[PDB]
Amino acid sequence: EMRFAAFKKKYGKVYKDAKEEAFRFRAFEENMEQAKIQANPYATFGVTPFSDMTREEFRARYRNGASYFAAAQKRLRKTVNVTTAPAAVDWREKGAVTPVKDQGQCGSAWAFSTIGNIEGQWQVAGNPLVSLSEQMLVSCDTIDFGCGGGLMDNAFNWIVNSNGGNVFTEASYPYVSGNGEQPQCQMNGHEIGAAITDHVDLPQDEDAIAAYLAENGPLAIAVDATSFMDYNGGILTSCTSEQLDHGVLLVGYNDASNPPYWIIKNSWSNMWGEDGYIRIEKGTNQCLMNQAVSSAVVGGPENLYFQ
């Protein structure tokens, strides 16, 4: 019970009354209880920022998400061929990944997946790495549902087809939905951080995805997040893989490991997992990561062989 107080003191949790805290502790107890059930064996599980909440709300927080992906799955995805694969790449070292962020009490992970992907593709184009705005998407993308959820595909389409291929920087358009508030769209007072021309979807092939990632940079993926709750670190190997319900970002992989793994960036700050990051086994479709991979396309200047 000391480690629950440690938890409270670590995340500044100030409960309403005895009753509200009462469950959170029972709930904390059960989350710690379940954490030793999953104890992906070769990964670590423990206390995270949501050991306070129950796995009925968690699974409820995704009910919408699940239903958006299932609806997207029913529609035709145009896959793009991959020209074809280094045993290991990791775009974090290659300055193609920004510090981890926090979606807060907002169902806005779709927006974080999109922004993260865009940032990676923009930097791999050969631009200076630059944080970009999720708020833009959360408040201004009328295809999607802001804190209610959305699809990366919808948002790629909104940027290109309703915002000229333009993405505003985080600095100029700051993330303020952390608290679940949804202010009106603000078109003025922003600086454009990046430009996209289109987006592509990728086939449901992990080998294919890796080659395009290795070649082009971080991609927006969707996973089943059910096994993510109590994760502290390691490589997941029995990820629950039943229903897609969360948008994350694939930043790399490594084949020279036993077993090999994908490197994924999440929108739950850094206090969660491996500094905001999770590793899942590659090549067995863990968390169904291959089902909804997609990537913005960067073009622009082409003076490579002209100077």
Numbering used by the authors: 38 to 76, 79 to 123, 126 to 348
Copy out sentences from the published article reporting this entry, exactly as the authors wrote them:
Rhodesain is the lysosomal cathepsin L-like cysteine protease of Trypanosoma brucei rhodesiense, the causative agent of Human African Trypanosomiasis. The enzyme is essential for the proliferation and pathogenicity of the parasite as well as its ability to overcome the blood–brain barrier of the host. In the cell, cathepsins are expressed as inactive zymogens where the ∼215 amino acid papain-fold core protease domain is preceded by a ∼20 amino acid signal peptide required for translation of the protein into the endoplasmatic reticulum, and a ∼100 amino acid prodomain required for correct folding and lysosomal targeting of the protease. The prodomain interacts with the active site of the protease and keeps it in an autoinhibited state until it has been successfully trafficked to the acidic lysosome lumen.
To prevent autocleavage and to stabilize the proenzyme, we introduced a mutation into the active site of the protein, C150A. The proprotease structure contains two parts, the N-terminal prodomain (residues E38 to T123 according to uniprot numbering, ID.: Q95 PM0) and the C-terminal core protease domain (residues A126 to P342). The first 18 amino acids belonging to the prodomain, a short loop between the first two helices (residues 77/78) and residues G124/R125 at the C-terminus of the prodomain, are not resolved. While the overall architecture of pro-rhodesain agrees with related proenzymes including human cathepsin L or C. papaya papain, pro-rhodesain displays a unique extended α-helix covering the entire cleft between the L- and R-lobes of the core protease domain. However, and so far unique to pro-rhodesain, a bulge forms around residues N103pro and G104pro, whose backbone amides are not involved in hydrogen bonds. In the pro-rhodesain structure, the S2’ and S1 sites are partially occupied by R100pro and S1’ by the side chain of Y101pro while a glycerol molecule sits in the center of the substrate-binding site. In contrast to the continuous α-helix observed for H3 in pro-rhodesain, the structures of all other available, nontrypanosomal pro-CathL proproteases display a mostly unstructured peptide in the C-terminal end of H3.
